[PDB]
Paper text:
In addition, two other datasets with 0.1 MGy better than 1.3 Å were composed using the data from plural isomorphous crystals. These high-resolution datasets enabled us to perform structural analyses using anisotropic displacement parameters with sufficient data to parameter ratio of ~3. As a result, we were able to obtain high quality electron density maps in which individual atoms were separately observed. The structures were almost identical to each other, with a root mean square deviation (rmsd) of ~0.1 Å in the superimposition of all Cα atoms. Consequently, distances between the hydrogen bonding donor and acceptor atoms were refined without any restraints, and their errors were estimated by comparing the three structures refined at a resolution better than 1.3 Å. In this study, distances without any restraints were successfully obtained from the high-resolution X-ray analyses. It is known that the distance between the Nζ atom of SB and Water 402 is elongated as a result of X-ray damage. The average distance in our three structures was 2.77 ± 0.03 Å. This confirms that X-ray damage was suppressed to a negligible level.
Numbering used by the authors:
A (entry chain A), B (entry chain A), C (entry chain A): 5 to 232
Amino acid sequence: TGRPEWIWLALGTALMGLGTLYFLVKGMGVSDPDAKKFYAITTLVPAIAFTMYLSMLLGYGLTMVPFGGEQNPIYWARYADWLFTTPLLLLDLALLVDADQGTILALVGADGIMIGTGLVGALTKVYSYRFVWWAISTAAMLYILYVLFFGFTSKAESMRPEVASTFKVLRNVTVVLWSAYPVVWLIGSEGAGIVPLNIETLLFMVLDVSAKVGFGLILLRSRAIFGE
Amino acid sequence: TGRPEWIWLALGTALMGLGTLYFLVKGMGVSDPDAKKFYAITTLVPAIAFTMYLSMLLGYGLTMVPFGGEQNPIYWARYADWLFTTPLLLLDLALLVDADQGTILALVGADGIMIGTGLVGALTKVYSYRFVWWAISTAAMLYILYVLFFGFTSKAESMRPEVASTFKVLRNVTVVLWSAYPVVWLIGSEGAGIVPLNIETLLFMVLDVSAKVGFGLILLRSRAIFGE
Amino acid sequence: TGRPEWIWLALGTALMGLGTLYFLVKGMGVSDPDAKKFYAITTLVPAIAFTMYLSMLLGYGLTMVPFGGEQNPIYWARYADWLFTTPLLLLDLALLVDADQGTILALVGADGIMIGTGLVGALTKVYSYRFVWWAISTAAMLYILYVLFFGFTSKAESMRPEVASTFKVLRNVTVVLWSAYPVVWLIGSEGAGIVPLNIETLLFMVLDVSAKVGFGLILLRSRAIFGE
Ligand SMILES: CC(C)CCC[C@@H](C)CCC[C@@H](C)CCC[C@@H](C)CCOC[C@@H](CO)OCC[C@H](C)CCC[C@H](C)CCC[C@H](C)CCCC(C)C
Ligand SMILES: CC(C)CCC[C@@H](C)CCC[C@@H](C)CCC[C@@H](C)CCOC[C@@H](CO)OCC[C@H](C)CCC[C@H](C)CCC[C@H](C)CCCC(C)C
Ligand SMILES: CC(C)CCC[C@@H](C)CCC[C@@H](C)CCC[C@@H](C)CCOC[C@@H](CO)OCC[C@H](C)CCC[C@H](C)CCC[C@H](C)CCCC(C)C
Ligand SMILES: CC(C)CCC[C@@H](C)CCC[C@@H](C)CCC[C@@H](C)CCOC[C@@H](CO)OCC[C@H](C)CCC[C@H](C)CCC[C@H](C)CCCC(C)C
Ligand SMILES: CC(C)CCC[C@@H](C)CCC[C@@H](C)CCC[C@@H](C)CCOC[C@@H](CO)OCC[C@H](C)CCC[C@H](C)CCC[C@H](C)CCCC(C)C
Ligand SMILES: CC(C)CCC[C@@H](C)CCC[C@@H](C)CCC[C@@H](C)CCOC[C@@H](CO)OCC[C@H](C)CCC[C@H](C)CCC[C@H](C)CCCC(C)C
Ligand SMILES: CC(C)CCC[C@@H](C)CCC[C@@H](C)CCC[C@@H](C)CCOC[C@@H](CO)OCC[C@H](C)CCC[C@H](C)CCC[C@H](C)CCCC(C)C
Ligand SMILES: CC(C)CCC[C@@H](C)CCC[C@@H](C)CCC[C@@H](C)CCOC[C@@H](CO)OCC[C@H](C)CCC[C@H](C)CCC[C@H](C)CCCC(C)C
Ligand SMILES: CC(C)CCC[C@@H](C)CCC[C@@H](C)CCC[C@@H](C)CCOC[C@@H](CO)OCC[C@H](C)CCC[C@H](C)CCC[C@H](C)CCCC(C)C
Ligand SMILES: *C/C=C(C)/C=C/C=C(C)/C=C/C1=C(C)CCCC1(C)C
Ligand SMILES: *C/C=C(C)/C=C/C=C(C)/C=C/C1=C(C)CCCC1(C)C
Ligand SMILES: *C/C=C(C)/C=C/C=C(C)/C=C/C1=C(C)CCCC1(C)C
């Protein structure tokens, strides 16, 4: 301790670490090349998040941003995490449905814009402008959610029932959990400052473990990850 | 205002934003997977440039570099833009001609070296050494231009007439506009300081809008982006 | 001079530069698409290392990190080099054996974790915690070495004798040289400080030139890089 939020950074570090080891063990010896893709993506996601949670816990992933007249604690390591782990999560979805390469490029690029503009917003010293970046980032998120629900209509005619079922579940998990992140950021330490950083850190920890370990448990238990 | 160059950063932000929205609308509903690739790449390019123009306009993308005895305004956000948008532009060219994967890797890697050494040159505090980085970056640019004109000779026997025609036009647009960037940098605020930053910013804005929105209008109006 | 290690940074810059030019010339005119892949990857690796050696030589790639009560010279440019060049080296191995895409993603992602946690360890101001990052990074390296020796068993039934022979040699080169890097870091300027930075710089220069130029000479002289 020293920072009240330490307990949630420690519990996030442990849960991401444990989820990593679990998926590592579970994927041992899988030979199906399609399934190997999904295990690699899905194991890397909490492994990256483990490192970035640990950097927050040890203080490396924290910086002070002046804005609003004050020195504001900003955990920038979250953006280094999400830069990699949110396109990886989208890649799992896109591979499930056999997405066209153009659609994957749109998703991963929109996601890069979402995280990079979120990071610029998190480090911006003029308070009002932080929310301009928040809005741009939210527009990119909405684009991604649009694509996830309306960009794969060529793929339904040809889509194994189990792939369609698992993709529907993971896409709903994604839309619900990812949509909460701009709200948390808006009311928390990076935005309006109406929820203290301790609670914010709690909220992102629950979202992250659910969106990474929860998501991956649903995916990796499904037969949709193997070629038929 | 406060910085004279604000007007060109604002007009660049608007033109990249407008070009983004135009390509977004134009690509709605395209189903051809090849065409979807080109729309995704070509829409992402001004979307990224919009964000980086906005960061320059709001001041986030500006830093002060000491060199030459003085505190020099350096817009570093241009390199964050180009890191992504210049390999994307090369990918559009390379996909037009069905380039081999090795050639795409050479292009994107040379381009990474060009932008990363340009960024090191832009932030280097020993004045003479800035131009060493400029020369290395220019060597990488020349390599890219060499490949664009001489690296696709296996592809001419088999190349639809419309693909060849559109590729020739976009490759000429690219060589002419991209070759102007080292010159601007050399005479401008990052180099010899013979053209003031206001005019430099103007010049890069005209080049960028032409090399991104102009380029993309030529590409996305062509039938070369659809499989035949 | 001014820093005793300058001579090894200069000799590393020259050897990476010379190796780059050699591979550039050697690959001129190769038409085989598989061979073009290997030349592009293998030429980019010392080209990137040349730029990062030069940045260390000129001082841009050096920063001072407080830890242990003192201001410690840390060459961060090594991590910017390795971020790109170590996944590229793994890609050469993986292409030799026709690795599945999931295995390539596991390798490149583990490698990203290895270099990024090595960089966090190199910049961490709390001394004991530097070694926590070192251990995590070493765990990722061990994972990569595990995959290289045990992740391609589906590929031996079908593997040209010359591909198998060249892959075995380069994999042994890789395991031996890469395993020395955590040791050097642990005893050198970033770790326990038992080997002075001058000697550390010497050691990394010999490893890097061997792991990039030595490796690439073995690869690019082999017929395993051409489709049969
Ligand atoms: C495929 C395409 C379509 C993709 C399109 C690209 C898309 C992302 C859109 C562009 C995003 C754009 C906003 C990038 C802006 C740069 C951004 C980092 C600016 C903020 O940081 C700059 C500095 C100086 O003030 O502050 C310091 C910043 C922070 C305090 C510290 C930085 C933390 C980083 C987020 C770490 C992650 C990035 C690493 C360099 C990668 C891993 C390195 C490894 C060796 C650890
Ligand atoms: C869907 C997603 C993309 C997300 C949407 C969010 C996004 C559109 C938000 C817009 C950002 C925008 C408000 C940035 C401008 C802020 C700035 C004008 C603040 C004023 O600054 C005050 C004084 C100096 O202290 O200047 C004041 C002097 C003047 C009053 C300032 C002149 C302002 C100009 C009109 C700026 C032009 C740039 C525009 C972004 C161009 C339009 C883009 C287009 C695509 C709609
Ligand atoms: C805020 C902005 C960034 C924009 C986002 C706003 C936001 C409210 C969007 C959330 C929409 C979300 C409920 C998804 C909509 C359901 C729908 C797409 C389902 C379609 O898919 C198929 C169905 C079964 O046939 O799936 C099965 C359907 C599921 C089982 C339905 C699950 C819905 C959840 C119960 C919703 C979770 C809410 C949170 C846990 C907390 C909400 C409290 C809030 C008021 C703070
Ligand atoms: C496929 C391969 C063959 C590719 C080969 C790789 C190729 C690129 C060659 C190597 C390039 C090499 C020169 C990299 C050098 C690192 C460079 C950033 C050094 C300058 O920055 C370091 C610091 C400290 O002094 O200054 C601060 C620097 C600036 C003031 C701020 C940094 C701005 C950045 C340019 C932002 C873009 C990078 C982001 C990390 C990505 C998006 C992050 C997102 C979350 C916003
Ligand atoms: C085609 C592209 C790659 C672009 C080409 C551009 C690129 C080749 C530019 C070369 C960069 C080079 C000049 C960097 C050296 C600058 C440095 C010597 C300046 C002198 O510094 C003055 C004092 C200390 O204050 O040192 C002075 C003491 C001594 C006089 C310094 C000793 C200098 C050494 C000879 C440095 C050796 C490193 C070389 C780069 C190795 C040759 C590379 C090869 C591939 C040709
Ligand atoms: C400076 C360094 C970084 C290195 C670069 C130097 C630089 C001058 C290189 C530019 C070369 C450029 C003109 C391209 C050469 C044309 C050629 C490749 C055409 C081949 O392709 C097919 C033909 C039709 O059959 O295309 C059709 C051909 C086109 C229609 C020809 C178009 C040429 C343009 C009119 C040139 C634009 C010049 C600028 C707008 C401003 C120049 C002024 C300068 C002196 C400051
Ligand atoms: C496929 C996937 C599975 C991959 C998984 C991702 C994997 C990498 C795991 C995550 C890594 C994670 C540790 C990233 C952490 C960010 C890291 C850079 C933090 C250190 O730097 C932050 C700052 C502030 O204190 O210090 C300053 C830092 C340094 C002093 C300066 C930075 C040097 C950089 C290393 C330069 C290289 C990165 C560039 C942005 C890329 C080239 C830019 C170009 C334009 C030169
Ligand atoms: C195989 C690879 C992954 C490489 C392995 C290396 C890696 C596992 C190293 C572990 C890092 C770990 C030691 C980080 C914790 C350091 C920290 C507790 C130091 C103590 O700090 C002292 C005071 C405050 O000044 O706090 C002291 C007060 C308390 C005593 C601190 C409470 C400590 C908590 C138990 C921290 C929990 C987080 C864990 C990492 C969760 C377990 C992960 C799981 C996957 C095993
Ligand atoms: C430290 C940690 C990060 C973990 C790593 C520890 C480390 C010691 C690991 C090194 C293992 C290494 C020797 C590889 C093992 C050989 C084996 C895999 C060979 C299998 O492949 C096929 C065989 C022929 O049939 O290849 C041919 C086999 C080769 C020809 C054998 C070559 C072995 C070398 C002679 C070893 C080089 C040692 C160094 C140059 C210096 C060692 C001194 C040390 C004590 C400081
Ligand atoms: C593994 C962590 C996950 C899935 C994180 C998702 C993060 C987002 C969807 C972030 C979105 C944001 C906005 C839309 C607005 C600006 C603030 C952000 C970056 C939190
Ligand atoms: C969208 C913006 C585009 C197409 C930008 C292109 C930028 C270049 C070709 C930059 C080249 C440079 C050099 C060759 C030397 C050093 C200075 C640079 C980075 C401006
Ligand atoms: C071209 C340079 C090469 C092949 C470099 C390889 C570097 C490594 C294998 C680095 C490994 C490290 C650790 C395992 C622990 C932390 C310290 C590092 C980054 C040096």
